[PDB]
Structure 1
Amino acid sequence: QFLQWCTLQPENCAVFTSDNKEMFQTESGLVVSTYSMVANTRNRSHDSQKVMDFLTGREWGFIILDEVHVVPAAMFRRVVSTIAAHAKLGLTATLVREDDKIGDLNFLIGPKLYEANWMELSQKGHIANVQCAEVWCPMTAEFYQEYLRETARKRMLLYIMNPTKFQACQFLIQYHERRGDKIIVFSDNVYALQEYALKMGKPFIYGSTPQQERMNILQNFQYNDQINTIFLSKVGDTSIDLPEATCLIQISSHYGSRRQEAQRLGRILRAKRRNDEGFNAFFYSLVSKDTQEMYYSTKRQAFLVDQGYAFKVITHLHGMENIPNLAYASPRERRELLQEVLLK
């Protein structure tokens, strides 16, 4: 995505995986590696071990790191002792990380110099005008009947599927088409996501979207205005290219327990060089009101207000029922879709 756009020529930066065998101990120039290959249980081959031996052999004067917090600092300290380098670098993503142990990776590498002040970045023009909202999808009888039925975690897709959520999504789609804006949707579901995509009848990103198809939809979404809504699932995120954020919609709110919300906020919200809309970065959390995840939607709201981004709630949708394709609008069809999701 960048290093060839960057000046880097990958001819020297051999990529090692313990599965992707590459040129070690012969690279004339700099190398690009990964924590999994450098020191992890995922040493599927001795290519990683040979890379580490070469790393010990050459006094690597500098090290570039990206998102070391996920990987435990134990392997970092082990390779720090093993390689005996001259200097390092930490390109952190979170203020507080699990690798803040007694031996801090700061003094292992160096002091702080700059902080990723997202209020400074997402407002100067990169992702300027970040507005957040949590639309409360109206409750229906079937959803609360299911709530009373069970208290397990299966209710996630059960309150996710609300057809009124799709109605609000379609209104957002048509509004942003009218404004010529771009829409990103976070929907890790499969069956309900495909049902909504069929209902809207437009080209769409979905769960495990093909990479070529995903790139085509991204082109037709950020460039073409006939299609402007993409549904990003949980398959991509940290494995795909982050598209410009102008209008973000979130549906699922589990994302493990924590720090996944922060990572998603940092990544999904990417630079958007558009200023036509007064709020050039919409955040939406379509939440079925009076459901299990009301508590976690409030948790998301508190998280966001901690993040400092502008937040609101728009449940007084203008022309909420005036949108086209009022399929499954009735609570009877809401219950039928609930029966469908109970299979999921």
Structure 2
Amino acid sequence: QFLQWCTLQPENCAVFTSDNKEMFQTESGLVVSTYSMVANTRNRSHDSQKVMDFLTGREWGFIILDEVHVVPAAMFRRVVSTIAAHAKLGLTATLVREDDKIGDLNFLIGPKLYEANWMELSQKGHIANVQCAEVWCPMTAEFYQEYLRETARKRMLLYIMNPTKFQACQFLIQYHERRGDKIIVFSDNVYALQEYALKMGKPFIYGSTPQ
């Protein structure tokens, strides 16, 4: 995106991820990295230790914290202190977290400059309109009976795999595919994700996947 929208020459851009760790040697350049590769404290590899020293030694002029709703976490906030910078910007669509650490952003990166409405940009053609829906798949009699006895932690897997949900997902997928739509099926539970994918013969992605 940086290359496409502005005239940033590729020579001055270095991506510090788990794959490649080379750093730009030109006087002034750009580093696009991740919190996991910059907030680590205990164990850094030899290849990743020179890069971190390269980041720390120089006095940067600007830091862009994408998805800044995770910076006030227990350890991610450490990067805001270690990295030297005279300007800090936070970019996030959602500025909410379950705990009370959201307010910590004030003394980490500063105040909230601007906010934008969602419907205003939707009616102006800048973002798409969505008809949100919530389908009620009544649990079948057989599955439901077990839901009463089982404990909290297993009850989750029980009400995620009820057959009616399989039928509803299969019907919607077929209906929208006929409409020439590209569908995404989210699932935080990996076992259900694999079971659904192998049952419908569709690709799936989860945490164990190589980049």
Alignment TM-score, normalising by the size of structure 1 = 0.47
Using the TM superposition, name which of 34-43 and 74-83 deviates more.
74-83
- Report Cα offsets for 1:246-297 as digits up to 9, x if no partner: xxxxxxxxxxxxxxxxxxxxxxxxxxxxxxxxxxxxxxxxxxxxxxxxxxxx
How far does residue 150 in structure 1 lie from its aligned partner after superposition?
A: 1.4
C-alpha RMSD of the superposition = 4.4
- Report Cα offsets for 1:200-224 as digits up to 9, x if no partner: 56677789678xxxxxxxxxxxxxx
- Report Cα offsets for 1:99-149 as digits up to 9, x if no partner: 986995445544433225333345543542211222111232211221133
Q: Identify if the C-alpha distance between structure 1 residues 82 and 117 changes in structure 2 by more than 3 Å, giving closer, same or farther.
A: same
The answer for the alignment partner of 1:325 in structure 2 is: none
How many residues get paired? Answer: 211
The answer for the alignment partner of 1:9 in structure 2 is: 9
The answer for the alignment partner of 1:155 in structure 2 is: 155
- Report Cα offsets for 1:289-308 as digits up to 9, x if no partner: xxxxxxxxxxxxxxxxxxxx
Q: Identify if the C-alpha distance between structure 1 residues 62 and 162 changes in structure 2 by more than 3 Å, giving closer, same or farther.
A: same
How far does residue 82 in structure 1 lie from its aligned partner after superposition?
A: 4.6
Relative contact order, higher structure (CA 8 A, sep 6+): 1
Q: Identify if the C-alpha distance between structure 1 residues 87 and 75 changes in structure 2 by more than 3 Å, giving closer, same or farther.
A: farther
Determine if contact 1:69/1:97 at 8 Å carries over to the other structure. Answer: yes
* 3-state DSSP of counterpart to 1:41: coil
User: Counterparts of 2:166 and 2:191 in 1: how far apart (Å)?
Assistant: 13
Q: Identify if the C-alpha distance between structure 1 residues 57 and 111 changes in structure 2 by more than 3 Å, giving closer, same or farther.
A: same
Determine if contact 1:69/1:98 at 8 Å carries over to the other structure. Answer: no
Determine if contact 1:36/1:42 at 8 Å carries over to the other structure. Answer: no
Using the TM superposition, name which of 197-206 and 116-125 deviates more.
197-206
User: Counterparts of 2:8 and 2:51 in 1: how far apart (Å)?
Assistant: 20
Q: Identify if the C-alpha distance between structure 1 residues 191 and 13 changes in structure 2 by more than 3 Å, giving closer, same or farther.
A: same
The answer for the alignment partner of 1:121 in structure 2 is: 121
Q: Identify if the C-alpha distance between structure 1 residues 127 and 170 changes in structure 2 by more than 3 Å, giving closer, same or farther.
A: farther
* 3-state DSSP of counterpart to 2:142: helix
Determine if contact 1:65/1:89 at 8 Å carries over to the other structure. Answer: yes
Q: Which has the higher helix share?
A: 2
Q: What is the aligned-residue identity percentage?
A: 100
Q: Identify if the C-alpha distance between structure 1 residues 135 and 63 changes in structure 2 by more than 3 Å, giving closer, same or farther.
A: same
Unpaired runs of 5+ residues, structure 2, are none
- Report Cα offsets for 1:50-108 as digits up to 9, x if no partner: 44544454332212211233244676765555554222211134334589869954455
User: Counterparts of 2:205 and 2:74 in 1: how far apart (Å)?
Assistant: 38
Q: Identify if the C-alpha distance between structure 1 residues 8 and 166 changes in structure 2 by more than 3 Å, giving closer, same or farther.
A: farther
Determine if contact 2:15/2:33 at 8 Å carries over to the other structure. Answer: yes
Unpaired runs of 5+ residues, structure 1, are 211-343
Determine if contact 1:138/1:164 at 8 Å carries over to the other structure. Answer: yes
Alignment TM-score, normalising by the size of structure 2 = 0.70
Q: Identify if the C-alpha distance between structure 1 residues 20 and 101 changes in structure 2 by more than 3 Å, giving closer, same or farther.
A: same
* 3-state DSSP of counterpart to 2:63: coil
